[PDB]
């Protein structure tokens, strides 16, 4: 689990990374070192049982989003991150973990290496991964692969600057399923 939480670089949320963990006792003691700006929220499971229940296969999904977007990483949620980047199912059994990463993932100029999808023709299915860079046609005229009127680049960078308020700072997220 250290190789996921302590990973030097996380993924962009439109291109979220999935690690299968198998035959591991899950030492959650790594999570105590992430206090003081840590959202931990479990669904279908007690957080306390995760230490003892060695699930034969866990998926650890990992990505970066804004602080105000962390609330969209839950079952039944809607919004640009939930609908077009990372959807959980409504019967989701597992755990959402998110911590402030502003010291690692911001720069004074802005860090722009983290992206998100801002437009898609339809919402994602649960755990669907859309990495496509095709021009989003909002209009009734073909884009022909060119950005223009009703013709948008589907991905956008954030901006992660150290001086931004907590809701605009980068949060590293790990979802366990």
């Amino acid at each position, epitope marked *: 689990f250290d190789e996921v939480f302590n990973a030097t670089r996380f993924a962009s949320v439109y291109a979220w990374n999935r690690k299968r963990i198998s035959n591991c006792v899950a030492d959650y003691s790594v999570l105590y070192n992430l206090a003081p700006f840590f959202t931990f929220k479990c669904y279908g499971v007690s957080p306390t049982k995760l230490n003892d229940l060695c699930f034969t296969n866990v998926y650890a999904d990992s990505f970066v989003i804004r602080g105000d977007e962390v609330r969209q990483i839950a079952p039944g949620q809607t919004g*640009n991150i939930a609908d077009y980047n990372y959807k959980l199912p409504d019967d989701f059994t597992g755990c959402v973990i998110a911590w402030n990463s502003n010291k690692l993932d911001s720069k004074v100029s802005g860090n722009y290496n983290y992206l998100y999808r801002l437009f898609r023709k*339809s919402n994602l299915k649960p755990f669907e991964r859309d990495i496509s860079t095709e021009i989003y046609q*909002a*209009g009734n005229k073909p884009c022909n692969g060119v950005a223009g009127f*009703n013709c948008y680049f589907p991905l*956008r960078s954030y901006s992660f600057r150290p001086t931004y308020g907590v809701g605009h700072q980068p949060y590293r997220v790990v979802v366990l399923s």
Partner: antibody
Amino acid sequence: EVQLVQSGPEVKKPGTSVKVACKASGFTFITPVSMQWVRQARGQRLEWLGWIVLASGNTDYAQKFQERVTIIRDMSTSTAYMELSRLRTEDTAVYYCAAPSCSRTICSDGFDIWGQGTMVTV
Amino acid sequence: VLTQSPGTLSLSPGERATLSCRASQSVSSSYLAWFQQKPGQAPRLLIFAASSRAIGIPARFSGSGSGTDFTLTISRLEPEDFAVYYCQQYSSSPWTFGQGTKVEI
């Protein structure tokens, strides 16, 4: 209904700046809508100033007024602003905002919703 | 550059107006637009995408043309149609209007 509500009339001196507001209602700024700025001096043609994407925040400007004009948005109040610096007497015009009637995942192919206009006098 | 013709068009109610727009040196005309403007009012869209009618625009209005040459036709003038008409190009930055055509009684 979608509506654009502009700020009231402005009287300025030459060399100063003006900042016209446009508050949009009835649609979310989450949609990739172009809000545009157009002016009309009395009895003159329409002049396009520039635009802003209401979802990404990317702007572009007509080359004649590219250095002075700055278009911005506030996502929290659903308000675009057009700021015009280094004002001249020739900048005396009704400034309009305009936007296409857009939906969650689909836009119209023409710009049909206009604000009522803001008279700027210089 | 868009050039409209005529500059003024005097016509009775019930007559057919026909208004030209010519695109000059450059084209790429794929998002063409057409507007009515009344005194003291903002411009209202009549036709978009060369010929597609705007919502709530009467069936007497029709747009046509491609490449360099475009036309707005009003098949039977009504007293509310006496106004200045403007064409406007797109995907051709700066997004230029024509100079207008005044329709009057």
